[PDB]
Amino acid sequence: LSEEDKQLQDELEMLVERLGEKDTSLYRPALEELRRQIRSSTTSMTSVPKPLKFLRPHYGKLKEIYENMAPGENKRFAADIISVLAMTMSGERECLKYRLVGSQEELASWGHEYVRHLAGEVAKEWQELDDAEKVQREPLLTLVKEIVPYNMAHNAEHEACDLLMEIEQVDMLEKDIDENAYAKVCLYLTSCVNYVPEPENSALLRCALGVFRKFSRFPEALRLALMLNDMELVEDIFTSCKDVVVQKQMAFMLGRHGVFLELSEDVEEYEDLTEIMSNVQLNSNFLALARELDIMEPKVPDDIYKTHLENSARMNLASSFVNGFVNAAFGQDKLLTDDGNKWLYKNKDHGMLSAAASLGMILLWDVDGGLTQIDKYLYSSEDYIKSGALLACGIVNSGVRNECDPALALLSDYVLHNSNTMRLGSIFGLGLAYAGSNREDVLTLLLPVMGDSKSSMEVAGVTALACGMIAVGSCNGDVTSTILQTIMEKSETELKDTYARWLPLGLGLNHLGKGEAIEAILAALEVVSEPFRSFANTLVDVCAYAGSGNVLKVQQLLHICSEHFDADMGAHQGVAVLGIALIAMGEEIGAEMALRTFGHLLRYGEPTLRRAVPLALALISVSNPRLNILDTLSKFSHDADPEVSYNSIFAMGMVGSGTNNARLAAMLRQLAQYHAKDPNNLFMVRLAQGLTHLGKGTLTLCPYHSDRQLMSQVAVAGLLTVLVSFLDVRNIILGKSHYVLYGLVAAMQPRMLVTFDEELRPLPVSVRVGQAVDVVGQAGKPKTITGFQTHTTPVLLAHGERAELATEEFLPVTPILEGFVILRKNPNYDL
Amino acid sequence: STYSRQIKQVEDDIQQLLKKINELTGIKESDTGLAPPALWDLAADKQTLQSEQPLQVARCTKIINADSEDPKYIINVKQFAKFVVDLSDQVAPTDIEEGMRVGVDRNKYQIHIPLPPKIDPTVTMMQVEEKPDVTYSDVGGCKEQIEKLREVVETPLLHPERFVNLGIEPPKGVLLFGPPGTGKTLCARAVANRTDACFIRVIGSELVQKYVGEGARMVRELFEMARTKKACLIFFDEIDAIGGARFDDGAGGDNEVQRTMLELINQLDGFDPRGNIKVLMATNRPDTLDPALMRPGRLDRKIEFSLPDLEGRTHIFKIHARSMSVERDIRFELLARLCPNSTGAEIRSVCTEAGMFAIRARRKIATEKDFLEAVNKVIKSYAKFSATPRYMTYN
Ligand SMILES: Nc1ncnc2c1ncn2[C@@H]1O[C@H](COP(=O)(O)OP(=O)(O)OP(=O)(O)O)[C@@H](O)[C@H]1O
Numbered sequence A: 001l002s003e004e005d006k007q008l009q010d011e012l013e014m015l016v017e018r019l020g021e022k023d024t025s026l027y028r029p030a031l032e033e034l035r036r037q038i039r040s041s042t043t044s045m046t047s048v049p050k051p052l053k054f055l056r057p058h059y060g061k062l063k064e065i066y067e068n069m070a071p072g073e074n075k076r077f078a079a080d081i082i083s084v085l086a087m088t089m090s091g092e093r094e095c096l097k098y099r100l101v102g103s104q105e106e107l108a109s110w111g112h113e114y115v116r117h118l119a120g121e122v123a124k125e126w127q128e129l130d131d132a133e134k135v136q137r138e139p140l141l142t143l144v145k146e147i148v149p150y151n152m153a154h155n156a157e158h159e160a161c162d163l164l165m166e167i168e169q170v171d172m173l174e175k176d177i178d179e180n181a182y183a184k185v186c187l188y189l190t191s192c193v194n195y196v197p198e199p200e201n202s203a204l205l206r207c208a209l210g211v212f213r214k215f216s217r218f219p220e221a222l223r224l225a226l227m228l229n230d231m232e233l234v235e236d237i238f239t240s241c242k243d244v245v246v247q248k249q250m251a252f253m254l255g256r257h258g259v260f261l262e263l264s265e266d267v268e269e270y271e272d273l274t275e276i277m278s279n280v281q282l283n284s285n286f287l288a289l290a291r292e293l294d295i296m297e298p299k300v301p302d303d304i305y306k307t308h309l310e311n312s313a314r315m316n317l318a319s320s321f322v323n324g325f326v327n328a329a330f331g332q333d334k335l336l337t338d339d340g341n342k343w344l345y346k347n348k349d350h351g352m353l354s355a356a357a358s359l360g361m362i363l364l365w366d367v368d369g370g371l372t373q374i375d376k377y378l379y380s381s382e383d384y385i386k387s388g389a390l391l392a393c394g395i396v397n398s399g400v401r402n403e404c405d406p407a408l409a410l411l412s413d414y415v416l417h418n419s420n421t422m423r424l425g426s427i428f429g430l431g432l433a434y435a436g437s438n439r440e441d442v443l444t445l446l447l448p449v450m451g452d453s454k455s456s457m458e459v460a461g462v463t464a465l466a467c468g469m470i471a472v473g474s475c476n477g478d479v480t481s482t483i484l485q486t487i488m489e490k491s492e493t494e495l496k497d498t499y500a501r502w503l504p505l506g507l508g509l510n511h512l513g514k515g516e517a518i519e520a521i522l523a524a525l526e527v528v529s530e531p532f533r534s535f536a537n538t539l540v541d542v543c544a545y546a547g548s549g550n551v552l553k554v555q556q557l558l559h560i561c562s563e564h565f566d567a568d569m570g571a572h573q574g575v576a577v578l579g580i581a582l583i584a585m586g587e588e589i590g591a592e593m594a595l596r597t598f599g600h601l602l603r604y605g606e607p608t609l610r611r612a613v614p615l616a617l618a619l620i621s622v623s624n625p626r627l628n629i630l631d632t633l634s635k636f637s638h639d640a641d642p643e644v645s646y647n648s649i650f651a652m653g654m655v656g657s658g659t660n661n662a663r664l665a666a667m668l669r670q671l672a673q674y675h676a677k678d679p680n681n682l683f684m685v686r687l688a689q690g691l692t693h694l695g696k697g698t699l700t701l702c703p704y705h706s707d708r709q710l711m712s713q714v715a716v717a718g719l720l721t722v723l724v725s726f727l728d729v730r731n732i733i734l735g736k737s738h739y740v741l742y743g744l745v746a747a748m749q750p751r752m753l754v755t756f757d758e759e760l761r762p763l764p765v766s767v768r769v770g771q772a773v774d775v776v777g778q779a780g781k782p783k784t785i786t787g788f789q790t791h792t793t794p795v796l797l798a799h800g801e802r803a804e805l806a807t808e809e810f811l812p813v814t815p816i817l818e819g820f821v822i823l824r825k826n827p828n829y830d831l
Numbered sequence B: 001s002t003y004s005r006q007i008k009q010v011e012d013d014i015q016q017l018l019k020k021i022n023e024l025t026g027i028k029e030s031d032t033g034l035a036p037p038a039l040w041d042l043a044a045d046k047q048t049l050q051s052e053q054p055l056q057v058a059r060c061t062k063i064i065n066a067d068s069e070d071p072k073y074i075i076n077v078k079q080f081a082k083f084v085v086d087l088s089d090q091v092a093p094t095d096i097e098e099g100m101r102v103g104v105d106r107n108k109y110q111i112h113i114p115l116p117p118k119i120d121p122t123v124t125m126m127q128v129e130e131k132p133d134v135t136y137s138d139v140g141g142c143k144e145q146i147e148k149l150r151e152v153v154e155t156p157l158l159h160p161e162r163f164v165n166l167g168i169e170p171p172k173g174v175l176l177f178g179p180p181g182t183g184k185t186l187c188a189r190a191v192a193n194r195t196d197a198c199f200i201r202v203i204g205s206e207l208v209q210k211y212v213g214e215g216a217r218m219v220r221e222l223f224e225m226a227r228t229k230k231a232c233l234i235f236f237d238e239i240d241a242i243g244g245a246r247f248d249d250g251a252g253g254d255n256e257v258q259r260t261m262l263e264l265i266n267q268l269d270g271f272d273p274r275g276n277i278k279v280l281m282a283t284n285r286p287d288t289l290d291p292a293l294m295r296p297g298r299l300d301r302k303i304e305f306s307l308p309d310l311e312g313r314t315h316i317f318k319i320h321a322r323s324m325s326v327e328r329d330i331r332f333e334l335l336a337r338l339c340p341n342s343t344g345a346e347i348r349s350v351c352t353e354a355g356m357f358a359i360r361a362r363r364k365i366a367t368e369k370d371f372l373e374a375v376n377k378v379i380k381s382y383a384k385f386s387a388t389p390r391y392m393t394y395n
């Protein structure tokens, strides 16, 4: 027993004796010392007064002192000691109570560990307090107006967000946000938006939006606005800024997301602002990029196939995709521009449909020049070539929104053309040409096509697909009425056709990411017959929660996969598997947690359930050639089930889409040898080889940009169109309808880092490119990249690779160094 | 600390859930080489154990009366016995040739399947399966060296059409020689990274074997397995281990290793055509190589990796200081001038030590003084151990 410890043990009696005297003259010196006695051990975080822990039973002698008389100074310091004794035990409605009723001095005077327990209490009791207890939060609010300023002072900022998120009072944070912690507070709660549910989903973003708006951080304010798909807030964010240099950067970000803004002519620099966001200069910027990467040389599919190292209508049609994919959006090809007639006519039947349309894909984003080349095939007498050239115009204008509209003009005259093939090349052309536009002009011109008597189910599906791309995530009322109308007007036998599966996607596309706005729509799907209703109900519900990660919805999806049927009744099971990927593609934690569940569907599953899980892997990790999925797919390329073999190989290509992975190409080359005598499997192998060398490695199909935080409506539409068509790979992809593989044209974007001057001209500087590192939590300045290297700016960024400027010569307009970035001279630099 | 109690509660549940998941799925053993149950096709395995009989590996020795309708095959079943057997009815008579390994059943020993030629497991491991992370952009000052290297070892395989039309037979051999640290293996690592054909890395010391004639055997099986590919690349790093010149010192000095070199010479240019193999040898002691090995048709191109010139040294400095946190005005041309005759290996170390001094001073940016001290420590202080002066006489 230490004498100093015994000295405090004496205060358990003699100081209480001083507080036991009737006169108040001895009350204050003992209590004031007792109040300071706590601070004596509070100066050390580990040191606590153990004799004080023996004073807990002594509160009975002090019970009347802090309760039975005036609260001036007798109860003031008497209760606070009990509060100090209250973090030692459970502290249910006690630690706060002596704090609430006792002294109302500065909170931090009692210790950082005390308030941390005190802060943990105020949230715990907040949930317990009901509506009738609103009179009980008067001192409760005062603490949080002082707890939050205390937390930011000692770099314990992340605890501050934890306080007012629990009490659902995130609003008051912005008033006390300082310049030294605005990024740290935003970076933390924005990372919580991937898991917290509605209504705290939007609300947490709104508070982060307010902080950025308050601190004039416009580029990162606009990023938050798009994530909330607030059409109104986008205009307010855009026009609030006065720095015109700052504003053109948004149009680059806004154009990359595919959302159009109709600015007023009164806005200064109106022209270039529209030009930048309309991606009209994307072709020149893309072409100038690859000129710096000296890959302008066209590539033959043989250079991709590498058959010289290897120890038909399908072959010619397969190589048409491999041709176009490799030099997509490049404008030059050694195989189609140079006497294309022999190659194009070397294909047969619907092979010429895709072969002709492949010419529009090598002119992707080349709206002006690309239209100059398809016209030669636009006058072809053969039914397929013109219609293939029709869809080629839509591919050419896909992803580019120019002011005056060519694509509608060249294809409007053919949406009611008597031959279905001529029609077929029209709607899919318009769908790609105006994906993510919500333009009523094209929609109203396209809407009666689905209701036509001459329109077959093949034409009926593409109209829903196309109209879905134009009105993706818009919840357009007009398209919902007609898509529902068509769905129930079709027969029981008519819905048996797998092309009928596309009508729900058009309805599902319209509500992409909208959430709970489907209960009215889902009620309408009740009236339609089975098993199409179960498929339609599952699909549209999935597209509703795309990129949301709502586990409750995924809980329903796994239950649909749980009950197996001894095909026809289990067609909907494939969509549920694709649903898990489409829902969990939001955050990394959910996506990787979904990979293991995909393996179990890949183990306990039935054929129709197991045929779609390769597609889920492609959607969940497109353009992300991670080894875990590739090895999972590699084992299952040579599977007994033909569709699983077909789907897995295609998934490998889409997983490595545009990555130009040397390891993946070696696997695909080996798969070509294994599947040489299987034309169907080899067609999938050939299809994958074209995708992995997409755009000569300068393009990506990943729907996410802005540090994998922004969801692109058009890209998911392009992907969903392809993978939902792959649920019947025998009849659609391998059949006569392989033009649906041109849906991913809507998902083609360049993995770009081009830094521009304030006058939009190229500005090559040294940058650091490496794998991104989470910067949540740890204070100070933690590095956000690991295993990084230094390149000049016009470099292709792989999935998950962040970029930081190596030097400080230029201050980026936006922290996110992706796509086109405007650089400004740093005034402190070269002081 | 407020969530500490709840975090451990959910962390333990996850661990309990993880263990419970492993109870149903099954993640165990892994010491008898058992695969995870997701890949277990038990129904098929039972069928394979009955439908697919095991086959014993045998070598055909002679075919008796091949012209007639009763062709009889003499097989050598390793250490078991020799049998005169007939061919199975599910394989063609023309598919079995004398001297080729075959698979025979255990009952009547009839040949059931032809088999690939036997290759030493060590020789099989010599082919590169994961390419290096080095490109030609990481080699500086070797512009002429690389173009000569590429147009023999890369261009013919990439674009063979440009040589057949003109009736051109491109060289099938390149010798890289120079002092240590000059980039001989660095260029070969760039070749393997870029190549699309099979790449086989063979270190000369790997060809030295305990027994007589074993080293020449591995050279035979090496070229046998290289010929099983449409186009192949063999890299002979440090060929001076086995490529030494022949001599007679009375005793049998280096007689065994000379035979390995004689076998390598025979496969490169002998009675038989070599094939589509394009060999590539690197040595820092080319003066020790046999004249027969250093002859065109075996080593057609002799690419010298001399120490870089001022432009080359400045280029290597740029390559190695690319990812560094260097200052503004690092006079890399001046640093290249401070090490007149220095290999690229020294330049890389100068870059490493230059940033190593900055780490020493708790500084995040390497200054020009740090490089000046690094040059003194590497080029000057470590000039006692420099391999350059002794090895330029050899090259
Ligand atoms: N031309 C060069 N450009 C850039 N770095 C170089 C160059 N030459 C050498 N280096 C660097 O120096 C190192 C020396 O290793 P390297 O394999 O090139 O040596 P070497 O010439 O094969 O030597 P040795 O004869 O001892 O086998 C390389 O790993 C590389 O990092």
Ligand SMILES: [Mg+2]
Residues within 6 Å of the ligand: B184, B185, B237, B238, B282
């Ligand atoms: Mg070496």
